[PDB]
Amino acid sequence: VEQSFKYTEPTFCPNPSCENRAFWTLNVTRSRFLDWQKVRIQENANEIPTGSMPRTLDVILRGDSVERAKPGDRCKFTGVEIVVPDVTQLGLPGKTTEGLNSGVTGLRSLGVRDLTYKISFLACHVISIG
Amino acid sequence: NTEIIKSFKNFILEFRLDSQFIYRDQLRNNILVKNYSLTVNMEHLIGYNEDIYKKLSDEPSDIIPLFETAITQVAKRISINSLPTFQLILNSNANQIPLRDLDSEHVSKIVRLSGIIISTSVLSSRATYLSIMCRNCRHTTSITINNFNTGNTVSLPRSCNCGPDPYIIIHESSKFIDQQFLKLQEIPELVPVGEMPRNLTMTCDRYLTNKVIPGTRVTIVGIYSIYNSKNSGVAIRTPYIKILGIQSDVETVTMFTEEEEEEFLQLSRNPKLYEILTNSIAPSIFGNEDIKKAIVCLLMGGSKKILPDGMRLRGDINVLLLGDPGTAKSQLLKFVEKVSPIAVYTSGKGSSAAGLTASVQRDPMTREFYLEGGAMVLADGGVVCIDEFDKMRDEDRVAIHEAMEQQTISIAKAGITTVLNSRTSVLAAANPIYGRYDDLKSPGDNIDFQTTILSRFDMIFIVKDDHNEERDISIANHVINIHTGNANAMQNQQEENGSEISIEKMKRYITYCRLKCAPRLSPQAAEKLSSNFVTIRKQLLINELESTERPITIRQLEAIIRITESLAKLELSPIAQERHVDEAIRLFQASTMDAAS
Amino acid sequence: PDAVFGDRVRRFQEFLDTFTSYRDSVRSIQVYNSNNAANYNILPHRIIISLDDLREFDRSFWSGILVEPAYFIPPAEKALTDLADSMDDVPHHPWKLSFKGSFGAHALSPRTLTAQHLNKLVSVEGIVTKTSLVRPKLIRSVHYAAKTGRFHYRDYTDATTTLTTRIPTPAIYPTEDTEGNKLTTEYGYSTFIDHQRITVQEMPEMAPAGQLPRSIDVILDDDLVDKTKPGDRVNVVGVFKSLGAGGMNQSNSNTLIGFKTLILGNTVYPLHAARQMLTDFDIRNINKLSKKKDIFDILSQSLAPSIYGHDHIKKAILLMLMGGVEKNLENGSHLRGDINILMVGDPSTAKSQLLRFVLNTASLAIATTGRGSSGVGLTAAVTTDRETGERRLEAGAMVLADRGVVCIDEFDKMTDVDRVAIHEVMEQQTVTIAKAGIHTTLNARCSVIAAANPVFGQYDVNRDPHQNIALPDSLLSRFDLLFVVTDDINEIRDRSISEHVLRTHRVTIPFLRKYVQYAKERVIPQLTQEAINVIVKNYTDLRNDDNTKKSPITARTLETLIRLATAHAKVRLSKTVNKVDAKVAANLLRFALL
Amino acid sequence: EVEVTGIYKNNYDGNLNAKNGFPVFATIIEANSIKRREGNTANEGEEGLDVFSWTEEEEREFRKISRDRGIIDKIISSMAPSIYGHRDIKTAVACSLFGGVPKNVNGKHSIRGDINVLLLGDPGTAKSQILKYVEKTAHRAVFATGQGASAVGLTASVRKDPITKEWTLEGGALVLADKGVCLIDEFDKMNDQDRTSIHEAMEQQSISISKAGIVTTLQAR
Amino acid sequence: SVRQIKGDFLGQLITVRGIITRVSDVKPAVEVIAYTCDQCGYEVFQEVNSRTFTPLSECTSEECSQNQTKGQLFMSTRASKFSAFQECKIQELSQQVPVGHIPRSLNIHVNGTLVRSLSPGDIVDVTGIFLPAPYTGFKALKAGLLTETYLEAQFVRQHKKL
Amino acid sequence: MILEGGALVLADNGICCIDEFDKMDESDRTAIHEVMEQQTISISKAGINTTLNARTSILAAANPLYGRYNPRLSPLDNINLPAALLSRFDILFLMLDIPSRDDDEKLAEHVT
DNA sequence: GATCGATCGATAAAGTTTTTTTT
DNA sequence: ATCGATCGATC
Ligand SMILES: Nc1ncnc2c1ncn2[C@@H]1O[C@H](COP(=O)(O)OP(=O)(O)OP(=O)(O)O)[C@@H](O)[C@H]1O
Ligand SMILES: Nc1ncnc2c1ncn2[C@@H]1O[C@H](COP(=O)(O)OP(=O)(O)OP(=O)(O)O)[C@@H](O)[C@H]1O
Ligand SMILES: Nc1ncnc2c1ncn2[C@@H]1O[C@H](COP(=O)(O)OP(=O)(O)OP(=O)(O)O)[C@@H](O)[C@H]1O
């Protein structure tokens, strides 16, 4: 259970002494799903000091809260925070000195890389006053 | 297999029909002049055995190479070393499923098609005989790669501690074949509901390449094998045609037999050609005698003089029509398209006039530019046809001025600046300012501003709308004959078979009589046109005293000397005469007084 | 190499009679290189073996050079290098060949390929339009051990030996040879060579129109680099060669060609159809043909032998084409030492006929046709990555116009882009741009030839003679001569016209082009204190008779009135400004202004 | 316009490169059937399924409906039921979609096999409805009306390439519609633009163009 | 001038005039190194090669190696000197150029303390020594034996400067 | 994304000598007012909204329209902006030409 | 059963002049 | 061409 932010390979504790971590087969039958979307937000008009490139961030809607967020309106959110990296996986090969903190983050137990950490945000419940 | 081979060296040296013994008697006749090729004609092959055909028509690639090796051995025998391998050319005529069977059963099966080739590519090289060296022990082998499943039929092995891939491709003892990657387009009349057509890809061999120019109908026989290129989801592949024999129609580079000109010389001895073509060109056109004479001289042309200094004379003519609707100015133009050797039909809107001449683009390999398209690069020797010279107001005028009168364009765009050759001949048909009221007012206002386009053309007809209450009923008698009952399919087979000329014989005919005789007008005939011209300018200036302005200049005068050169190409006489030249001005003097009215 | 060397050995004793006439030539070219350089207070190693002298008395040694030219060239090098030191060694670079002669039907136009003479000799002509970079490349470095003080020696082969199929050495600096010495390398004692990739088009006149011009490419070496300008009728001949691995590489090379056709060649020859040599005989005839007092009038009508009259025009072209000098001001802006004439005419009066026969006698002046594209005098940062990671400003049409002439058509029938383009490049000799790269002030000495048509038909007499076509008068001010071609009807004129179009369906040109390209390199008088006096009287009257007549003039028109007479004395080939030059310059303007 | 009936499926490839790699999965809709655009979506049991399959109960019936004596006086009266009006338009507009024949010929000029009516009406009679009603009763149609009809977008046009592609040919209205319906009333500002591109769909019938592309000729009767 | 410097002028000393363009900034280059293990304190030294290099292991020293516990290496800035560096490109005088081709650029470097003494627009000349450098990237499918050289500066002789 | 510029962000308190006043006027004609309009040389792009100084004199030579400027005709037939001329400038000059017998031959001697 | 050594496989590339409708 | 990971062999 509990596939993490990159755990596309459940490879722990087989029943018999078979070849553990040898393969997998993502069954579309029993593994129940849920539906989501990824939208961007923006800061309200009555708080900007000047035209000073008003920054933003990104959210994730998880439950039934999909499609309740009509785009282009003043809106409120739940408030759980999160940080999500994704640089090393099975498929595709993974300016300034952005990600300079990442050099500290090296040398995990798997292969030596430069793993970053970017701030993001998760929601649970939406409301739209106005 | 070897057994199968034993069954072809023992077959292509004694197959015959009744005492002609043909296949030895052309293989010898193809080893003297260097061609190294066969024409099996598979429908004529079947006389041995249906089984040996059926080991061919059900399985591929293996059969072609075994047959090729057998032919090479027989060729080697007919001699007593410089002996190359041969190539095959097969041909049949079953029927052409046009572009509909795609995947069902026609994968690696013999097939016959029909299309129009539009796009050639530059040549290339693949190898066929190699000599391979190893790094570690200086081993030496030789591997031949004949037929294909494109490359990667077999790869270089590992055999000769010893490191893998130890082998290299030297270039000192090798041979090479060229491929094409020319692209076939569907003949645009036989997939009709509402859809755009599609396209395929095809390669070939050296001794049957460079036999096509774009703009022709071709029939083609070959294989439907499948390659796989890794520069899309499921593990897919792509289709292409390995081709064998382009036994198409004529070229439409003047090599042909002798009996094709035998009847042509037997026809040209009859001095009735000029009056009979005016009937025999357009079998569904009510008369229009003055215009019909102008089309046969446009298709033939004059000459090209590169006289001993730098300049040259533009030896061709360019007619122009205009007139009321409903008077055959448009439907006549599809008729000249099929009869021409090379003909292009871009007759609408001008089609973004900068794109008429040449175009560049970013090209996906190497991110570069070169020159690809144009409506004038492909139409050399032949004739283009366009219309609607009123409501192309943007840039049609600036795109034909350099294109005409010197035929030497040069593209000044981001890459090359080259003067590519052109020998084109233009043709157009337009509308005046709604026809009728233009011919009931001051007789200008035809082209609204410029006379400078009219001075580049020379020959101009002006049709009109009379009310002759006698001949029109014969025209109303004429259209009901052709339109239903179709008796002209039976009338023009019971008056044509001894008198008239069919529509496809002229396409055979014009390409021969142009490319042989280089004519010249009579030198004592120069007194005639000089005495003719001096009153025409007097006939001009008698009108300008009436507060009348506009167009006649000297360029039409050096067009009449091309007009009298035109019928000399028809009669194929190297000298001209005076019965010749007086009929030519008889055509132009019926378009001299048009400037008055 | 025992059996593959005896015929190489037999050639070494054979062809020593073939350079009975060149064994002087091989040593005489280098004894002054041993004397120029030793006494400073320069030539490559080029040994032109004629094909005749080898064909004249050898067959088997001759036949291999046009069938299998892959075993036979480093023979002729190997004899040639030991016949240089054995000639001259006492004073304390392999002398490769050039190989000129005839060939016997190997003039393969590269629209056609070979099917039989792959990997053989081939003569190829055409025009080049690519002109890629220049970059050095090693052949051999010399390693050195600092400890124990002894050197080493290593050669690295590439696709430049042209004939042998060497095992490649893809190493850059093999360090730490079988010792314990930290290796060094004297790079001054190393040796280097350069490459240049150039693609050649087809000469687009003898290729019959069924295709666009194709192209192949050629890799040459150090002797003939920077020799070919883009736009030269070049002639080259070298070996034919394929390289690269293709079709049988490790996996999945389906329907991919793998044989890059290349040419490793020699002897790049310009042609002319600057090289015009002339003896004492023909150089004295033009001195004898500088003698008469009529040669400006004879040369005028001996130019275009098809069109009547326009002797004001026919003198103007030859006056312009030879051109005038520009004395550049020391620490000052030079003025417009070029000359830029213009024509306009009511249509079909041969106003465009005479613009293209100047291109046959152009003397390396290739013009465009004026198509509505930006690139007339710029690049717009076309780089094509210059083989993966380099940016170059490839010149459009001003690398060719330098000390030459151009001609373009349909001035009024253009968009606004060329109007600002010919603005700067006329008042200023050069152009400078940082499109996506760097500013660069590349120079160009050029001169235009114009052509345009009036819009409103036959209206050049009933309206203003000025403001007549309304293209911006900045260009009209920057040009001088605006000829208005008349075509009025005279009954003897057109009668004479009617026969001269009939007698053209059947003192000379190459003597004419030799005359100007010899008179472009002689003296320039500029000075006569009284010929300058008559012209200012010849101007100030019409300076007071400019508004009382049709056209107003400006002050820069005075710089025309010296410049026409300056080149008019160049027709005389004299170091003195005479008096008679100030009469042709008068009435030529008097026809252009009345 | 199409609408598709099939199954839903998933393919968790475990690799996506627009967003980051994440515990997500793509979408693939395989199909079992496909039908054409439908019209007047108000039915309950018919005219949504393209049956058009005149097998037994129709073809055995449809002969005796053809051997009567006043059918052409009955069909055109009963064609457009909602509008009583003057007779002659319903004679013409029924004749228009019935069509003639593209009778080919030997190696000579082809013959137009089309009939092209033109209505003229007062502003307030039923002329805008018969054209609206005949759009349903045809098999295929188009309704490019009024302003906004481009001078090129009716016929074929070239859409430029995406980031690694070639200049391909993507036609618009007239190549799709075999029996199309336009409304050329008086869009006068664009009347001098488009009307040079529709009056050669009839005259030089099967017109196609070569603006900066390939010289081809599509066939649209 | 740069139009004729193609040949035997590698590894030599040649002065060339020109026009200085594309002045970069001053960046610290590396000449010595000192990794710290925080156990034995033996700061390891090494020479600096071209523009890319690689650190070493931690079980290599003489005290903090060779035991069951090893001092894990990491760097330190101030235990190593750092030099100056600035890059510039040259063009031609627009009068020694021939009638044909466009001018050709070149790369130059600086060392020692000649830095911060050039300007964009300086009609100057540099005197310096010659060296080609390898590319060390994509060595098989490109850059077989190519050079893409530069020149190394020694002296600048600038001119025309109540 | 460095802050490259033209003249007025680097020619502060100096001389800005311009030519060709009828060239690229869709951006020029506003900005030349903005130095005579006091202290608004700025970069009001999407990047930032910072404003630097403006202290430079202007010397302008507006070339006339077609032909000679007809002196019998009205002025402001070849000048573009009247609002700059009325109060945003102070004084004008002119370079008329009259055919003169005495002066132009000296002017001919001035150039010969 | 664990550790070390050897062999095999996978990893690094780059853009910005012509042409369409539109205001 | 270099680095990392996996597999096989030896202690
Ligand atoms: N002179 C003629 N002889 C025979 N048939 C003719 C003639 N003129 C017109 N036609 C007939 O007219 C029919 C249709 O022509 P179409 O409708 O293309 O004319 P159109 O293009 O309007 O005329 P125009 O070319 O003057 O505009 C053709 O089938 C053709 O047979
Ligand atoms: N004034 C003339 N005298 C003699 N021949 C002439 C004259 N005008 C035209 N010609 C003949 O016309 C032919 C070509 O004329 P050309 O095409 O150059 O006209 P043009 O200058 O192109 O006119 P435009 O530029 O207005 O199209 C030449 O072969 C030439 O013999
Ligand atoms: N003869 C008629 N029978 C039944 N209804 C009619 C009749 N004439 C008009 N109508 C009704 O009048 C309404 C108005 O539409 P109408 O057909 O008048 O538009 P129109 O005037 O044809 O428009 P346009 O002039 O733009 O084509 C229609 O909905 C239609 O139902």
Tab-separated table of C-alpha atoms in Angstrom, chain C residues 171-286:
chain	number	residue	atom	x	y	z
C	171	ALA	CA	43.024	9.615	-28.630
C	172	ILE	CA	43.706	13.268	-27.933
C	173	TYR	CA	46.805	13.135	-25.721
C	174	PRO	CA	48.002	9.667	-24.703
C	175	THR	CA	49.820	10.479	-21.474
C	176	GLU	CA	51.875	8.291	-19.106
C	177	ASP	CA	53.703	5.968	-21.472
C	178	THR	CA	55.263	2.768	-20.093
C	179	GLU	CA	57.529	4.489	-17.557
C	180	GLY	CA	57.112	6.608	-14.453
C	181	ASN	CA	57.563	9.954	-16.189
C	182	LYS	CA	54.967	12.724	-16.183
C	183	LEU	CA	54.902	13.343	-19.912
C	184	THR	CA	55.396	16.659	-21.685
C	185	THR	CA	55.017	17.601	-25.343
C	186	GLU	CA	56.731	20.381	-27.304
C	187	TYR	CA	53.786	21.717	-29.307
C	188	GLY	CA	56.056	24.070	-31.223
C	189	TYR	CA	57.804	20.929	-32.430
C	190	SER	CA	54.398	19.464	-33.273
C	191	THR	CA	52.709	19.823	-36.648
C	192	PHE	CA	49.254	20.866	-37.766
C	193	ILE	CA	47.029	21.191	-40.824
C	194	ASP	CA	43.625	22.673	-41.595
C	195	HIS	CA	40.296	21.735	-43.155
C	196	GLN	CA	37.605	23.564	-45.091
C	197	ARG	CA	34.244	22.177	-46.172
C	198	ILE	CA	32.753	23.738	-49.305
C	199	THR	CA	29.710	22.681	-51.324
C	200	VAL	CA	29.531	23.207	-55.079
C	201	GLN	CA	26.305	23.817	-57.008
C	202	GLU	CA	25.611	23.078	-60.657
C	203	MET	CA	26.287	25.627	-63.364
C	204	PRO	CA	22.604	26.211	-64.070
C	205	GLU	CA	22.753	26.536	-67.849
C	206	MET	CA	23.997	23.182	-69.179
C	207	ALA	CA	21.713	21.351	-66.743
C	208	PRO	CA	18.388	20.874	-68.583
C	209	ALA	CA	15.402	22.026	-66.585
C	210	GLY	CA	13.773	18.998	-65.030
C	211	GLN	CA	15.301	19.490	-61.614
C	212	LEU	CA	16.691	22.080	-59.266
C	213	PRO	CA	20.500	22.341	-59.009
C	214	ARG	CA	22.020	19.575	-56.898
C	215	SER	CA	25.211	19.754	-54.861
C	216	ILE	CA	28.148	17.770	-53.537
C	217	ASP	CA	31.048	18.817	-51.352
C	218	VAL	CA	34.825	18.705	-51.200
C	219	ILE	CA	37.428	18.679	-48.429
C	220	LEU	CA	40.681	20.372	-49.407
C	221	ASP	CA	43.947	21.139	-47.635
C	222	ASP	CA	46.327	23.933	-46.646
C	223	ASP	CA	47.722	24.918	-50.042
C	224	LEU	CA	44.460	26.130	-51.563
C	225	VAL	CA	42.529	27.476	-48.570
C	226	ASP	CA	41.125	31.065	-48.707
C	227	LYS	CA	41.411	30.868	-52.514
C	228	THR	CA	37.758	30.515	-53.489
C	229	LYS	CA	35.385	33.387	-53.043
C	230	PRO	CA	31.682	32.481	-53.037
C	231	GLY	CA	30.648	33.049	-56.634
C	232	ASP	CA	33.623	31.845	-58.687
C	233	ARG	CA	33.501	29.474	-61.644
C	234	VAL	CA	35.805	26.940	-60.067
C	235	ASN	CA	37.268	23.746	-61.490
C	236	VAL	CA	38.557	21.031	-59.187
C	237	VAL	CA	39.731	17.453	-59.608
C	238	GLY	CA	40.518	14.917	-56.924
C	239	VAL	CA	39.803	11.349	-55.891
C	240	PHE	CA	36.350	9.983	-55.169
C	241	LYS	CA	35.881	8.600	-51.691
C	242	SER	CA	33.243	7.225	-49.357
C	243	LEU	CA	33.683	7.122	-45.595
C	244	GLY	CA	31.753	6.326	-42.451
C	245	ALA	CA	30.040	3.154	-41.309
C	246	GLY	CA	26.507	2.560	-42.506
C	247	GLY	CA	23.857	-0.111	-42.784
C	248	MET	CA	25.702	-2.638	-40.623
C	249	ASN	CA	26.221	-0.572	-37.473
C	250	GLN	CA	25.315	-2.196	-34.117
C	251	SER	CA	21.483	-2.182	-34.498
C	252	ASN	CA	18.397	-0.685	-36.116
C	253	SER	CA	19.969	1.231	-39.011
C	254	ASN	CA	17.047	0.612	-41.345
C	255	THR	CA	16.528	2.712	-44.516
C	256	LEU	CA	19.379	5.062	-43.599
C	257	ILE	CA	22.170	5.815	-46.047
C	258	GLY	CA	25.637	5.338	-44.683
C	259	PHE	CA	28.075	6.391	-47.365
C	260	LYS	CA	28.873	10.084	-47.340
C	261	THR	CA	30.330	10.837	-50.753
C	262	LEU	CA	33.342	13.118	-50.420
C	263	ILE	CA	36.152	14.475	-52.559
C	264	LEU	CA	39.720	14.852	-51.275
C	265	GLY	CA	41.266	16.951	-53.984
C	266	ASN	CA	43.912	19.309	-55.309
C	267	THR	CA	44.452	22.033	-57.976
C	268	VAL	CA	41.512	24.429	-57.580
C	269	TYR	CA	41.342	26.361	-60.850
C	270	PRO	CA	39.388	29.552	-61.449
C	271	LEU	CA	38.163	30.115	-64.976
C	272	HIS	CA	36.460	32.784	-67.081
C	273	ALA	CA	33.592	31.709	-69.346
C	274	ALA	CA	42.100	37.965	-63.162
C	275	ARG	CA	43.866	35.183	-65.065
C	276	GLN	CA	44.303	37.206	-68.264
C	277	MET	CA	47.977	37.007	-69.204
C	278	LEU	CA	49.215	39.002	-72.176
C	279	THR	CA	52.513	39.211	-74.042
C	280	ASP	CA	54.450	42.196	-75.378
C	281	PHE	CA	52.494	41.956	-78.645
C	282	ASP	CA	48.914	42.465	-77.452
C	283	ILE	CA	49.987	44.947	-74.776
C	284	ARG	CA	51.559	47.067	-77.526
C	285	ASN	CA	48.506	46.855	-79.772
C	286	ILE	CA	46.391	48.489	-77.073
